[PDB]
Amino acid sequence: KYPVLKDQPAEVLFRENNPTVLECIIEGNDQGVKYSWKKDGKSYNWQEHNAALRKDEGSLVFLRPQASDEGHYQCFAETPAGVASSRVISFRKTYLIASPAKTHEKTPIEGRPFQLDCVLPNAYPKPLITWKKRLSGADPNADVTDFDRRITAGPDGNLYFTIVTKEDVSDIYKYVCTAKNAAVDEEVVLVEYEIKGVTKDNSGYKGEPVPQYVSKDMMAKAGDVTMIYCMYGSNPMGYPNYFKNGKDVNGNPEDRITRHNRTSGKRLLFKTTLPEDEGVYTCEVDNGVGKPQKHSLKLTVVSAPKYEQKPEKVIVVKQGQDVTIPCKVTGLPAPNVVWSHNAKPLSGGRATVTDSGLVIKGVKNGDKGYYGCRATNEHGDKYFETLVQVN
Amino acid sequence: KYPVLKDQPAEVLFRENNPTVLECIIEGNDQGVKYSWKKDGKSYNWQEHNAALRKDEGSLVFLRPQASDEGHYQCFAETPAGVASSRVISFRKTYLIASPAKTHEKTPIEGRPFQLDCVLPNAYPKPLITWKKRLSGADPNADVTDFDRRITAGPDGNLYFTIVTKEDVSDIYKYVCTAKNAAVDEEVVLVEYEIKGVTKDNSGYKGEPVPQYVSKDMMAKAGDVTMIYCMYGSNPMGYPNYFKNGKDVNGNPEDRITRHNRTSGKRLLFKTTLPEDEGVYTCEVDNGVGKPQKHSLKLTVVSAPKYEQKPEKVIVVKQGQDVTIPCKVTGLPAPNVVWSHNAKPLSGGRATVTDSGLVIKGVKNGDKGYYGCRATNEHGDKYFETLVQVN
């Protein structure tokens, strides 16, 4: 069609020393366009560095990225129409650093809350912690098994036994904690545990529910999946009740929000979070034994800028007519829009900024070019630009 | 510290379109060296293609490899001493092609051998087939990959039930078969199964072990891991016995060769194969019921070239003395040694080829350079070169 940039990702991770590319393709008629990158604001001279530009595009390929290559990169394609711009792309280094897996033996007291600790590694992005009952000497792809309902992993990465019993003992299964992320191809093992036996309880634990883990106030992105945890150690095992500002909220195994997600009520799951879920959530654990326990949490839903009206890819107008580049953005907190024309700030002349778009009245020739709408807030930075081709 | 090439891998895989590098670094004093690549024999002009050379090295980075880029690449570093060469590196494309997962229902006859078939995809390298009991929707745990003792996966990718019972039925678990390899980041699902019920055996099968799967004669590379399978459907479940040319071979859970690998004796595992393992393996399954079963096959151990004497990284001698570039290679079949001097074949002059190395008597000046020993056979191609610096 016309010379326009293809959309690109918000962030691109790279494994140190591994070749990675920062995309930048020109859709349509890409004749005589010159591409240039800018990093962290100042201009980037790739020729000088250890990088190269992909052939028929502006994509910058790092031949061996270093930690010092991290940064904010923006691309600019100079075309007959003007200067297209890419969103600002975040280039970060992905990794997972963990000390060698150490195997530990444990002999916990029977009928009493327990928990295996996991040593979270230094990594980015945040890794995925998984816990598994690992059969020894078996093949990696055929060694996992299931945990009782008494056992659940918290969002902190630890395994929680509401009460540990003798059935939790084994001479061949290991309680392993593993982590994986974009920096490795197969999960890494952080620590291993072996429950070899269980001591009898002399100091008679009553059974009163005691906090093992409980979610604190939190933020949540609308459309995301939220999980509020209420893990208590009780005897017998209790089923937490959940209330949103006082009203019941347990639902069923298949509602949007429910405590029935195979965790024995240890977790209230929002299959999908909405703004209306904001409120103070309370949970109560009563198991007969002792005083019942209560906990309060405030779920706050926030959101990255959302384009209720994505700028048009292209707008062709005739010298004279008035053009209206549409653009409406919403968000929480409210995003703040910044307009650009050919990669620079506006200039009072004819361009009128409304909340539903930009309006240029007396369209002359020097008005042609790319108009960019940048929506931003502490939860995201987005950018979409429309090429205004007049003639 | 003279110019010497760093060792490199035998094969480098690439995911179509993804930037990949074929290394080539010069250890030591790398001043004024010129790097050049040759693909499939003919000379490679990277500048002309969509590739670039890493900065202070000879490493060739493909900015967007295509299927047509596959091939055998060799590198040559032109240095003051002569021309160093890398081994020939095999550049291949990795992929995993599978038809969309189809879910199938199954109602097998009770108390009788069973097996779920898995549709192996088209891929390279060979993928890893994993089978798992997949709980449907919302599962906070890891999929269960540890089934009854009656269930084991064969080397062909199928799941084998020695006998299928009512315990193998479920309306919430699915028997899933997945495959993963270097071409994908997370496992791909090949086929799903649901055992919803079981019919009653109307053909009085009394429990006699019947072959479900048994390994046939096979070849094995020395140093690799070999698995001999002997999967029979019996009631009660039997433990196969393993014999090598008549002598017992079951060993223990931690010997080099053992039937104790968490497969209930359905597999004899060689943690690492040696030429001494060649022989006729026999296995017998007796479960009381009926006549005992026997099976044999011929295991032949082969091996890629092995350097009993790796050429030295560097040898400095004085004009006059006689140098002896050592090099001894073994293999099965016997590898074939090919010598080179500065990237070309020898020349009768002074160079005398013995089995333990190359011998140059009257060392003059034109003798200086890199001498390469190439060992090859149908199981491997290795190359190591010695720089002979005289003065």
**Contact present, A339 and A375 (Cβ < 8 Å):** no
For residue A283, give the nearest of A228, A340, A240 by alpha carbon. A240
User: How many angstroms separate the CA atoms of B226 and B219, rounded?
Assistant: 9
For residue A106, give the nearest of A37, A19, A169 by alpha carbon. A169
Provide the b/e sequence for B357-375 (b: ≥16 CB within 10 Å): bbebeebeeebbbbbbbbb
For residue A323, give the nearest of A234, A389, A241, A380 by alpha carbon. A389
User: How many angstroms separate the CA atoms of A201 and A233, rounded?
Assistant: 15
B104 and B196 part of one domain: yes
Provide the b/e sequence for A348-372 (b: ≥16 CB within 10 Å): eeebeeeeebbebeebeeebbbbbb
For residue B329, give the DSSP letter. E
Chain B residue numbers touching A175 (CB-CB < 8 A)? none
Q: How many CB atoms lie within 10 A of CB B174?
A: 19
The reply to whether B126 touches chain A by the CB within 8 Å rule is no
B189 and B107 part of one domain: yes
Report the alpha-carbon angle B224-B228-B231, nearest 5. Answer: 150
The reply to whether B143 touches chain A by the CB within 8 Å rule is yes
The experimental resolution of this structure, in angstroms, equals 3.1
CB distance B144–A147 less than 8 Å?
no
Q: Domain ends where: A303, A321, A356?
A: A303
CB contacts < 8 Å between A and B, how many?
89
CB distance B140–A146 less than 8 Å?
no
User: How many angstroms separate the CA atoms of A247 and A340, rounded?
Assistant: 48
The structural domain count of chain B equals 4
The residue among B141, B177, B180 with the most chain A CBs within 10 A of its CB, best to mutate, is B141
For residue B96, give the nearest of B65, B69, B119, B124 by alpha carbon. B124
Cβ-nearest to A21 among B19, B128, B254: B19
Chain B residue numbers touching A144 (CB-CB < 8 A)? 132, 142-146
Q: Which residues pair with A151 in a beta bridge?
A: A161
Give kind and range of the element (H or E) at residue B379: none
Contacts of A303 (CB under 8 A, 6+ apart): A221, A222, A223, A275, A331, A332, A379
Distances (CA, A) of B46 to A63, B6, B69, B91, B121: 14, 21, 11, 15, 34
Q: How many CB atoms lie within 10 A of CB A328?
A: 17
Q: Which residues pair with A13 in a beta bridge?
A: A92
Instruction: Convert B182-196 into a string of H (helix), E (strand) and C (coil).
Output: CCCCCCEEEEEEEEC
Cβ-nearest to B21 among A19, A144, A253: A19
B276 and B334 part of one domain: no
For residue B44, give the DSSP letter. P
Chain A neighbours among B 156-195 (CB < 8 Å)?
Answer: 182, 185
How far is the alpha carbon of A248 from chain B, nearest alpha carbon, in Å?
Answer: 22
A109 and A154 part of one domain: yes
CB distance B131–A142 less than 8 Å?
yes
A152 and A163 part of one domain: yes
| Strands A357-360 and A351-354, sheet pairing | antiparallel
CB distance B144–A139 less than 8 Å?
no
CB distance B128–A137 less than 8 Å?
no
User: How many angstroms separate the CA atoms of B24 and B8, rounded?
Assistant: 7
CB distance A55–B61 less than 8 Å?
no
Contacts of A195 (CB under 8 A, 6+ apart): A106, A107, A108, A164, A168, A169, A170, A175
For residue A328, give the nearest of A305, A363, A356 by alpha carbon. A356
Q: Domain ends where: B303, B325, B357?
A: B303
Instruction: Convert chain A into a string of H (helix), E (strand) and C (coil).
Output: CCCEECCCCCEEEEECCCCEEECCCEECCCCCCEEEEEECCCECCCCCCCEEECCCCCCEEECCCCHHHCEEEEEEEEECCEEEECCCEEEEEEEEECCCCEEEEECCECCEEEEECCCCCEEECCCEEEEEEEECCCCHHHCCCCCCCCEEECCCCCEEEEEECHHHCCCCEEEEEEEECCCCCCCEEEEEEEECCCECCCCCCCCCCEEEEECCCEEEECCCCEEEEEEEECCCCCCCEEEECCEECCCCCCCCEECCCCCCCCEEEECCCCHHHCEEEEEEECCCCCCCEEEEEEEEEEEEEEEEECCCCEEEECCCCCEEEECEEEEECCCCCEEEECCEECCCCCEEEECCEEEECCCCCCCCEEEEEEEEECCEEEEEEEEEEEC
User: How many angstroms separate the CA atoms of A35 and B5, rounded?
Assistant: 36
The reply to whether B198 touches chain A by the CB within 8 Å rule is no
Chain A residue numbers touching B144 (CB-CB < 8 A)? 144-146
B70 and B105 part of one domain: no
Residue B361 phi/psi, 5-degree rounding, is: -90, -75
Chain B residue numbers touching A133 (CB-CB < 8 A)? 146
User: How many angstroms separate the CA atoms of A222 and A229, rounded?
Assistant: 19
Chain A residue numbers touching B185 (CB-CB < 8 A)? 185
Give the full edge-to-edge strand order of the sheet including A357-360: A323-326, A357-360, A351-354
The reply to whether A1 touches chain B by the CB within 8 Å rule is no
- Give me A184's structure tokens: 């490795």
B291 and B353 part of one domain: no
**Contact present, A189 and A176 (Cβ < 8 Å):** yes
Instruction: Classify the C-alpha dihedral A161-A166-A167-A169 as positive or negative.
Output: positive
A144 and A195 part of one domain: yes
User: How many angstroms separate the CA atoms of B186 and B182, rounded?
Assistant: 10
A329 and A383 part of one domain: yes
| Strands A188-195 and A102-106, sheet pairing | parallel
Which residue in this structure is represented by tokens 């996992």? Answer: A144
Rg of chain B on CA atoms, in Å: 28
Chain centroid to CA A194: how far? 33
Domain housing B26: 1-97
Contacts of B181 (CB under 8 A, 6+ apart): B94, B96, B123, B124, B125, B126, B127, B128
What residue of A is the nearest CA neighbor of B54?
Answer: A63
**Contact present, B305 and B223 (Cβ < 8 Å):** no
Residue A285 phi/psi, 5-degree rounding, is: -120, 115
**Contact present, B286 and B205 (Cβ < 8 Å):** no
A10 and A88 part of one domain: yes
Instruction: Convert B268-297 into a string of H (helix), E (strand) and C (coil).
Output: EEECCCCHHHCEEEEEEECCCCCCCEEEEE
The reply to whether A47 touches chain B by the CB within 8 Å rule is no
B199 and B212 part of one domain: no
**Contact present, A134 and A141 (Cβ < 8 Å):** no
For residue B73, give the nearest of B125, B26, B22 by alpha carbon. B22
The reply to whether A152 touches chain B by the CB within 8 Å rule is yes
How is B225-261 classified by DSSP, letter by letter?
A: -EEEEEEEE-SS----EEEETTEE----TTSSEES-S
Cβ-nearest to B55 among A50, A59, A138: A50
Distances (CA, A) of A332 to A10, A219, A298, B286: 19, 11, 17, 71
Distances (CA, A) of A138 to A75, A172, A379, B168, B259: 50, 10, 44, 21, 12
Q: Domain ends where: A74, A97, A120?
A: A97
Q: Identify the CATH number of the domain in which residue A105 sits.
A: 2.60.40.10
A281 and A361 part of one domain: no
Contacts of B378 (CB under 8 A, 6+ apart): B333
